[PDB]
Design a protein around this ligand. Structure first.
Ligand SMILES: Nc1nc2c(ncn2[C@H]2C[C@H](O)[C@@H](COP(=O)(O)NP(=O)(O)OP(=O)(O)O)O2)c(=O)[nH]1
Ligand SMILES: [Mg+2]
Ligand SMILES: [Mg+2]
Ligand code: NA
Ligand code: NA
Length: 325
DNA sequence: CCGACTGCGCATCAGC
DNA sequence: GCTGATGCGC
DNA sequence: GTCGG
């Protein structure tokens, strides 16, 4: 639906959400406001009253009350005030730097460090992640057009196969759902030699090759199963924005549960789990399991493709395209 | 009334 | 030194 | 902040 429907309300709720997460450090209030924001964003009518909004799941007494104030006045007194607050708005802003959370942001603002400029001045007080986040502050907040994501996929699948043709790599996330743009790139990686009961250079070798051809440019974090970092498409034209890329190495017997999980959406993943229990199965990130007569979970069932998971719960395979809910 | 709201990998801190 | 807790991102 | 046991 059009933003001009309830965009004022959803903007208000999103703004309240961020201050809860970043300033009050109340993560559950943060998700509460966002849940309320989401369901109102989907609501196909211009809301006339807080009581009207309250019918929706996720909208309670306090938000219905806040909406009443917004509709009547065009603003929120509390929001106006906190917007104004130099301390709170600075803390809120610094968290936009990847690696700087609520705790670091507060500590920085505590000692007078409030801006990117201030961060740029105080490099030795930033850890490795926070420096990278600072270095690519602008780039990290850009979205990635699908065409560039396709070019990025080309390089990943090529270099991965070059390392070992028996690797299996799948670019999941919104891109796999066929979105016209993405926030980052999520690559899931496996190899027949790696199972749950199973070299742990399997991830390193792929990262290394992607670094060698200068696709991967920076490393945020890297262990034996998970890589988080920065990549960039090759350039006399203007150079591309640096992009966030994650690579996960998953055991083969857990790969397609992994692919399903990290393809999303979260809203879709929720239903699929809920319907999975109603059929007597439990689905998490790693496995699908039967729930015995009292709720005792048996051994993880063998999964060799996505559809296998759909078959167990008697679902017909839904294409990633049709997985926004 | 009052507990749940995903929980894990990695980097780094806190403490022994 | 090591172990467990915390911060962070997702 | 919201929901529900
Ligand atoms: N249990 C649980 N799992 C979650 C939750 N939130 C997310 N997940 C899981 C399920 C999600 O699929 C995954 C996050 O993948 P991203 O790449 O960060 N999001 P995407 O790629 O779709 O969009 P973008 O284009 O912006 O990158 O984490 C949660 O609250 N609870
Ligand atoms: Mg993504
Ligand atoms: Mg991601
Ligand atoms: Na409600
Ligand atoms: Na941040």
């Amino acid at each position: 639906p059009q933003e001009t429907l309830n965009g004022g309300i959803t903007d208000m709720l999103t703004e309240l959400a961020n201050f809860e997460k970043n300033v009050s450090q109340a993560i559950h209030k943060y998700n509460a406001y966002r849940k309320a924001a989401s369901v109102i964003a989907k609501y196909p009518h211009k809301i006339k009253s807080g009581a009207e909004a309250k019918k929706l799941p996720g909208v309670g007494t306090k938000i219905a009350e806040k909406i009443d104030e917004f509709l009547a006045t065009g603003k929120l007194r509390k929001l106006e005030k906190i917007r104004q607050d130099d301390t709170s708005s600075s803390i809120n802003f610094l968290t936009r730097v990847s690696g700087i959370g609520p705790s670091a942001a507060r500590k920085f603002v505590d000692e007078g460090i409030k801006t990117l400029e201030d961060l740029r001045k105080n490099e030795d007080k930033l850890n490795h992640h926070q420096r990278i986040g600072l270095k690519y502050f602008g780039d990290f907040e850009k979205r990635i057009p699908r065409e560039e994501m396709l070019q990025m996929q080309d390089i990943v699948l090529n270099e991965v196969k070059k390392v070992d043709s028996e690797y299996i790599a799948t670019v999941c996330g919104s891109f796999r759902r066929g979105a016209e743009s993405s926030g980052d790139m999520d690559v899931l990686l496996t190899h027949p030699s790696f199972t749950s009961e199973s070299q742990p250079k399997l991830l390193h070798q792929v990262v290394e090759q992607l670094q060698k051809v200068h696709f991967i440019t920076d490393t945020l974090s890297k262990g034996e199963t998970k890589f988080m970092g920065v990549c960039q498409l090759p350039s006399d034209e203007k150079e591309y924005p640096h992009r966030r890329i994650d690579i996960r190495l998953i055991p083969k017997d857990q790969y397609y549960c992994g692919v399903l999980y990290f393809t999303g959406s979260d809203i879709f993943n929720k239903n699929m789990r809920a319907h999975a229990l109603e059929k007597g199965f439990t689905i998490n990130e790693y496995t699908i399991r039967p729930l015995g007569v009292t709720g005792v979970a048996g051994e993880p069932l063998p999964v060799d493709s996505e559809k296998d998971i759909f078959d167990y719960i008697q679902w017909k395979y839904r294409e990633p395209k049709d997985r926004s809910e």
